[PDB]
Amino acid sequence: ASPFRLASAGEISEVQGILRTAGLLGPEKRIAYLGVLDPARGAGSEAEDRRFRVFIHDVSGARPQEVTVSVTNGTVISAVELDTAATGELPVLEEEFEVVEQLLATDERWLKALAARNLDVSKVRVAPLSAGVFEYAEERGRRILRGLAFVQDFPEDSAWAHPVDGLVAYVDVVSKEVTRVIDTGVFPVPAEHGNYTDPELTGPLRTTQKPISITQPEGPSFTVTGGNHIEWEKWSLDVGFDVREGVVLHNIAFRDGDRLRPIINRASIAEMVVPYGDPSPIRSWQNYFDTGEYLVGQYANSLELGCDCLGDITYLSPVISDAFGNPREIRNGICMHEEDWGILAKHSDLWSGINYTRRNRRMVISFFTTIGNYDYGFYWYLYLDGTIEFEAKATGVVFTSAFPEGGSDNISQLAPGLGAPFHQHIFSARLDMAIDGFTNRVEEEDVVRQTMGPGNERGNAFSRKRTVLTRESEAVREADARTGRTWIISNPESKNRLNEPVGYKLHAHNQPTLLADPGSSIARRAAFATKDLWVTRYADDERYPTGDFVNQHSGGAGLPSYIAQDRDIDGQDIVVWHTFGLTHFPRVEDWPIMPVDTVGFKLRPEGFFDRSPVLDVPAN
């Protein structure tokens, strides 16, 4: 009955039938995105209308369409033809991954480049990479992918160990033309294999690890009702799933006495970008938006009990659409479990004689996605004490190149002849805030150092200052680790028992933001990534920091366009966008398969409760 329930196979079958009957899903059409729309603000009228947004691609060159359908009424609500030169191309289709390799395999220029290298075309894998927007006027309005080549010596070989540097091709995947083949010279193809399951490389496997057994003899402490409504240790929320964003959290709230208090209306990772810092023309165009261009949710892994998720695991199996509108289940695509998290609070008192210890725990909601060489785990954590934390785990295989004789300032060496270009992994969290309701404000909090003098005669005092962000034009903020900068989201109309506004404090990791020159193409297309924090006024159609159609969009869409409206955000329905990322100078230890590295953020209560909220936790 909940409007926030996961999409069902039946709903997706209905969408397909509706589009087919309307003449919108003929043999030349492909569904490039399908997703359920969130209820509009103020859905307290009990009028459920399950609506789906669809992006429809046409493989014969006709204009794509954006379509909204209602499955409750079985109708097409709206249907719009898209001018992709203006508003951007549609996301990459899975079925296009192989088209780039296949088109190059018959192009004379491609074949001549491989022949000069004595490479058999049947052994050459081509990575299908997004094109971006650069200097090539012939690409405007066309659907372009760029291809970089890797050799697979045998079917089970890791191609990433054998990059073919000095060579790149551009392909129009709709007209099926190879527009350019660029060959800047021959590099040796690195010869060592990178097969991390080969006994020659691993040596004998360790026999020293004894098992760790994690069980819950009475089952887990959380309940799931309605398919995706979670209640755990006074928390409640709905777990959604979208093919673009992946796991989405709705209606995060905390049961404080008899009051269910909202905290966050919608939480998601709304974009991610991986910009490469190698100035070689073979790769200087390389920036992929895994969320916006490829849709991370459709590549979610099926997670294996005892390997990917350990303990008493409850699974969700979300349903998405394939390119023809058929429902497809991602079996065991979301793990949910609780974890012990050490000591929560502890004190031994010299005067009362009381010794007190309580243990902490967290609820874990996670999925894993794979797009080409990279793999990412997305983890949401809820803690007993009201903290909310997000963590990204990056692993997989680093993207490789040749390592040039004489070295490089932008590439590190991993093995003889084998390089890995410098790059970043940058995420955008979209936090539709609802601290005790929708009237919220953001304050920037800095430490204040004080001068020794009158009123501070011993020079020990220090303080803090809070600046309210009142309009969107002043709500584009930078981190400052040196001054301990944080941001507080408060409700000025809801006060704690000390008559102070209730609030939550956002703690960032203060990692570097986008490094590229501010005049670059990527700085214009990923403008969100140049600043740590943005605050906008909520609006239904302002969903992604990069806009709706990221692929081959020329720039400026999303957050820079939103904040130009300069809307009031002081005690209003607001959205926080936090940029956070890893800057990756690859090390030898990242090869041939990368141990996990992590980045994230957390929010902690800041006078939201009237005292510690975990006084009622038992001794265990």
- In the set 165, 293, 432, 472, which binds Na ion (CB under 5 A)? 432
Phi then psi dihedrals of residue 481, to 5 deg: -60, -35
> Could you confirm whether 196 is annotated as catalytic?
no
State which residue, 226 or 279, has the beta carbon closest to a copy of itself.
279
| Beta carbon of residue 275, minimum distance to a copy of itself (angstroms, whole number) | 7
Interaction of residue 573 with Na ion, rule CB under 5 A: yes
State which residue, 2 or 439, has the beta carbon closest to Na ion.
439
- Token readout for 521 is 């193409």
Interaction of residue 374 with ligand O=CCc1ccccc1, rule CB under 6 A: yes
| Beta carbon of residue 293, minimum distance to ligand O=CCc1ccccc1 (angstroms, whole number) | 7
Beta bridge partner(s), residue 319: 329
Query: What is the residue whose two structure tokens read 């073919």?
Result: 164
| Beta carbon of residue 390, minimum distance to Cu ion (angstroms, whole number) | 18
Q: Answer yes or no: is 538 a known binding residue.
A: no
Q: Answer yes or no: is 584 a known binding residue.
A: yes
Phi then psi dihedrals of residue 231, to 5 deg: -125, 125
The closest of 534, 558, 535, 536 to 546, measured between CA atoms, is 558
Residues 617, 620: Cα–Cα separation, whole Å: 9
* Single-letter code of the amino acid located at 95: E
**CA separation (Å) from 466 to 139, 200, 442, 444?**
48, 59, 10, 5
The phi-psi region of residue 417 (left if phi > 0; otherwise alpha if psi is between -120 and 50; otherwise beta) is: left
Long-range pairs of 41-50 with CB within 8 A, sequence gap ≥ 24? 41/538, 41/540, 41/573, 43/3, 48/3, 48/72, 49/73, 50/3, 50/11
| Beta carbon of residue 97, minimum distance to a copy of itself (angstroms, whole number) | 7
Cβ atoms < 10 Å from Cβ of 398: 23
| Beta carbon of residue 68, minimum distance to Na ion (angstroms, whole number) | 23
| Interactions with Na ion, residue window 492-551 (CB under 5 A) | 538
- In the set 149, 433, 594, 603, which binds Na ion (CB under 5 A)? 433
Among Cu ion, Na ion, ligand O=CCc1ccccc1, none, what binds residue 110 when CB lies within 5 to 8 Å by partner kind?
none
The closest of 525, 522, 557, 527 to 542, measured between CA atoms, is 557
> Could you confirm whether 597 is annotated as catalytic?
no
State which residue, 378 or 438, has the beta carbon closest to Cu ion.
378
State the number of binding residues for Cu ion (CB under 5 A).
1
Point out the catalytic residue in the list 170, 276, 374, 562.
374
Interface segment toward ligand O=CCc1ccccc1; rule CB under 6 A; list 123-131, 228-236, 246-254, 440-448: 123-131
Q: Answer yes or no: is 316 a known binding residue.
A: no
Q: Answer yes or no: is 196 a known binding residue.
A: no
Interaction of residue 387 with ligand O=CCc1ccccc1, rule CB under 6 A: no
Q: Answer yes or no: is 425 a known binding residue.
A: yes
State which residue, 426 or 574, has the beta carbon closest to ligand O=CCc1ccccc1.
426
Among Na ion, Cu ion, ligand O=CCc1ccccc1, none, what binds residue 127 when CB lies within 5 to 8 Å by partner kind?
ligand O=CCc1ccccc1
Q: Answer yes or no: is 544 a known binding residue.
A: no
| Interactions with ligand O=CCc1ccccc1, residue window 260-319 (CB under 6 A) | 288, 290, 294
The closest of 406, 159, 374, 149 to 283, measured between CA atoms, is 149
| Interactions with ligand O=CCc1ccccc1, residue window 127-186 (CB under 6 A) | 127-129
Query: What is the residue whose two structure tokens read 């193809």?
Result: 189
Among ligand O=CCc1ccccc1, Cu ion, Na ion, none, what binds residue 573 when CB lies within 5 to 8 Å by partner kind?
Na ion
Interaction of residue 584 with Cu ion, rule CB under 5 A: yes
**CA separation (Å) from 361 to 126, 197, 382, 467, 507?**
45, 35, 9, 34, 20
Among a copy of itself, Cu ion, ligand O=CCc1ccccc1, none, what binds residue 129 when CB lies within 5 to 8 Å by partner kind?
ligand O=CCc1ccccc1
- In the set 8, 373, 494, 554, which binds Na ion (CB under 5 A)? 554
- Token readout for 615 is 């006084």
Cβ atoms < 10 Å from Cβ of 497: 9
Q: Answer yes or no: is 294 a known binding residue.
A: yes
CA-angle at 357, arms to 352 and 360, nearest 5°: 150
Q: Residues 525, 133: contact at Cβ < 8 Å?
A: yes
- In the set 152, 360, 373, 410, which binds ligand O=CCc1ccccc1 (CB under 6 A)? 373
- Token readout for 404 is 């040039």
Q: Residues 78, 67: contact at Cβ < 8 Å?
A: yes
Among a copy of itself, ligand O=CCc1ccccc1, Cu ion, none, what binds residue 584 when CB lies within 5 to 8 Å by partner kind?
Cu ion
| Beta carbon of residue 447, minimum distance to Na ion (angstroms, whole number) | 28
Q: Is 389 exposed, middle or buried (0-12, 13-18, 19+ CB in 10 A)?
A: middle
Residues 234, 285: Cα–Cα separation, whole Å: 48
State the number of binding residues for ligand O=CCc1ccccc1 (CB under 6 A).
10
Annotation: binding site: 288-299, 371-376, 423, 425, 584
Residues that bind Cu ion (CB under 5 A): 584
Which residues are the active-site residues?
290, 374
Annotation: binding site for Cu cation: 423, 425, 584
Residues that bind ligand O=CCc1ccccc1 (CB under 6 A): 127-129, 288, 290, 294, 371-374
Annotation: binding site for substrate: 288-299, 371-376
